[PDB]
Design a protein around this ligand. Structure first.
Ligand code: PLP
Ligand code: PLP
Lengths: 398, 398
């Protein structure tokens, strides 16, 4: 009697399964608007110049591949805290935060989930509906219940703040509430500063533990501005957790560079808690991969490389905003009667197109255009060369 | 009332806690025989030449960092299966095996444990007494019970084959039994081929699911020879799991390069099982880090680089063998009256020294010689320059 005989096949990942269909499609002119990769104006996914410079430096100067500590490169953790909280933050001066280098933002989310499930009485995590599909899997893998809160007004293409507030009414003291720090995935709709401040006050009154997922810092307005919501929470909370990723804003997707940051009331408490976070990492992958995080730490700690990187990040933010405008314009030019102007108000790589599952299927099967079944399209996959055919396809299924 | 306030500090890792103490130790003569790192004759922990050359190729030819698939680089998987099972194996031609690239051997162990606990009826894993200390933590954290079988005869410094087989008669069908492929950690004592064949037959009769941990392929006798015990299992079993590591045989510790290989009765079953292993990876770190695995796959797939690497591995293995001999001879010269000849018959980086916990504590506090509290010593940390002080210290505590 085989152990593997009773196993049920896993469903296809809603995002990665799509990219597998795309790689199999033999039809010429297929267009990939699925997975969240940054493409340049020629349809390629390049390595940043700042990253190549840093990798050259590492090649010439690394003398050993000796294991990192469980929590990773120390300079990486410190530069990360400055990015998130600000160079002179009280949180850093009071030594209230500890950061672990992790394998991507995904790995940072799993490390937090394992830590919470094993060392606290947290039973429940609240996630926006919609959210990144993998959020539920990560927290469920540690045995945590995941509930959903309302977020998106699909009528006005706006944040439904009233429904958000009402739907979080039953989130209890000691529940985790997950917020996207900026560039909400998939809607591209973020709270305003005043909405963030309102959420911060309510969180402290209700006793929630906030967990911020930061995968797109620098893609909305700028590095400092995109962190304003987080910093409004950090000014008011004793405790919070930040999972952050450098996959997107350094174009380091496949090197798995992220961080999990813990904040507690004081230095002694966060050190105690962090020692249990390190134990959860040790029972998982033991210590994190060095190459990607070394690149990031090299760039952030060298003024000249850092200035190259900040300009590269700006050029990527601006290309995406330009494509958002060109998309709306070309849809009108190609004859759409539906108003797509809301696309211009959305932030980051993704917008909710408002297409139905049926229309997304038609686009894939009839026109070779690949989006996620929720209607999320990757605007950063749009180029001046593929824009007209893409828009003709959409207009055809409207 | 903070969520983190009542968390208890985690105890130190028996291996990584020692490394921290050693780093902080201010004495210039300190000697590190704890963590399993390869040192060259001069006390350095070098990057291999094959690896530097492969990294230079990657630097100049890499055009993108786009995500690998969940299971990683395909050539890496194929080359791993060839090393494990042999260039013309029936497991491979029958398409009975699927491999996922993982963040180290540690990550491969957690992926297997998550996959087992979430998709099968397995409740119990059997691990040798003694074993690598992190084995229990990994399987306990996935929710599996850990049971110990007998292995080492401490009086005779030998494998107690009878005790082992008696202990394992309590293991039931559908339990997982974990075997070290070669260079048993910490004892350095491995089954002979005959004993492997005996366990393999006994394994099918009782219905165990074998799990091989293969972190030292090439450090006992040779690449092919060190897999004989696994290949005897593979010829008889419908199902098995191998977690393997390239940290040590490539000196790639901090890049986290390993693999989890699943074997099932046929191609249809292993694909069904592998789909759930991918789901378990997706909810952990999503996809594995590219740099380290790309280096390995570049080396194994290029005949000139492979030849360099295979010579560098031979040199490491022989250097360790020369140190085992030198250690025994120098102990007698420095006035030890115990017979340490058993060290010569142990394989790999580690010997079980027979020192007590109290003697190990003295070696550290009074002499700055760092060994694990079990008395395991890293022979690969021994050099001609530190042999005399190390042996004088040991004689002083007998
Ligand atoms: C909201 C959110 N969190 C986490 C991630 C995962 O990032 P990473 O590739 O660093 O694991 C993504 C993007 O993939 C994301 O959009
Ligand atoms: C038996 C055994 N399994 C697994 C590992 C973990 O290897 P890695 O560093 O690749 O995670 C080690 C040592 O590191 C080991 O000795």
């Amino acid at each position: 009697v085989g152990t593997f005989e009773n196993i049920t096949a896993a469903p296809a990942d809603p995002i990665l399964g799509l990219a597998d269909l795309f790689r199999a499609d033999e039809r010429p002119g297929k267009i990939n608007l699925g997975i969240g990769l940054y493409y340049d104006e020629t349809g390629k996914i390049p390595v940043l110049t700042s990253v190549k410079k840093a990798e050259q430096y590492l090649l010439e100067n690394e003398t050993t591949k000796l294991y990192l500590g469980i929590d990773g490169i120390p300079e990486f953790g410190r530069c990360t805290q400055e990015l998130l909280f600000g160079k002179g933050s009280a949180l850093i001066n009071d030594k209230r935060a500890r950061t672990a280098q992790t394998p991507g933002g995904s790995g940072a989310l799993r490390v937090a989930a394992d830590f919470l499930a094993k060392n606290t009485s947290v039973k429940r995590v609240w996630v926006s509906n919609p959210s990144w599909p993998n959020h539920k899997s990560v927290f469920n893998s540690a045995g945590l219940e995941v509930r959903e809160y309302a977020y998106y007004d699909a009528e006005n293409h706006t944040l439904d703040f009233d429904a958000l507030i009402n739907s979080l009414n039953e989130a209890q003291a000691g529940d985790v509430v997950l917020f996207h720090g900026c560039c909400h995935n998939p809607t591209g709709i973020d709270p305003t500063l005043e909405q963030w401040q309102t959420l911060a006050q309510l969180s402290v009154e209700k006793g929630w533990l906030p967990l911020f997922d930061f995968a797109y810092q620098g893609f909305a307005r700028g590095l400092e501005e995109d962190a304003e919501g987080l910093r409004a929470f950090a000014a008011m909370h004793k405790e919070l957790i930040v999972a952050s990723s450098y996959s997107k804003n350094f174009g380091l997707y496949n090197e798995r560079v992220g961080a999990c940051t813990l904040v507690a009331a004081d230095s002694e408490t966060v050190d105690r808690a962090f020692s249990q976070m390190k134990a959860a990492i040790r029972a998982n992958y033991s210590s994190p991969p060095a190459h990607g995080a070394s690149v990031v730490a090299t760039i952030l700690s060298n003024d000249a490389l850092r200035a190259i990187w900040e300009q590269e990040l700006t050029d990527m933010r601006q290309r995406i905003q330009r494509m958002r405008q060109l998309f709306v314009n070309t849809l009108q030019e190609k004859g759409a009667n539906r108003d797509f102007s809301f696309i211009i108000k959305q932030n980051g790589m993704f917008s909710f197109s408002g297409l139905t599952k049926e229309q997304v299927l038609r686009l894939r099967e009839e026109f070779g255009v690949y989006a996620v079944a929720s209607g999320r399209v990757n605007v950063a996959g749009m180029t001046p060369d593929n824009m007209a055919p893409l828009c003709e396809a959409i207009v055809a299924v409207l």
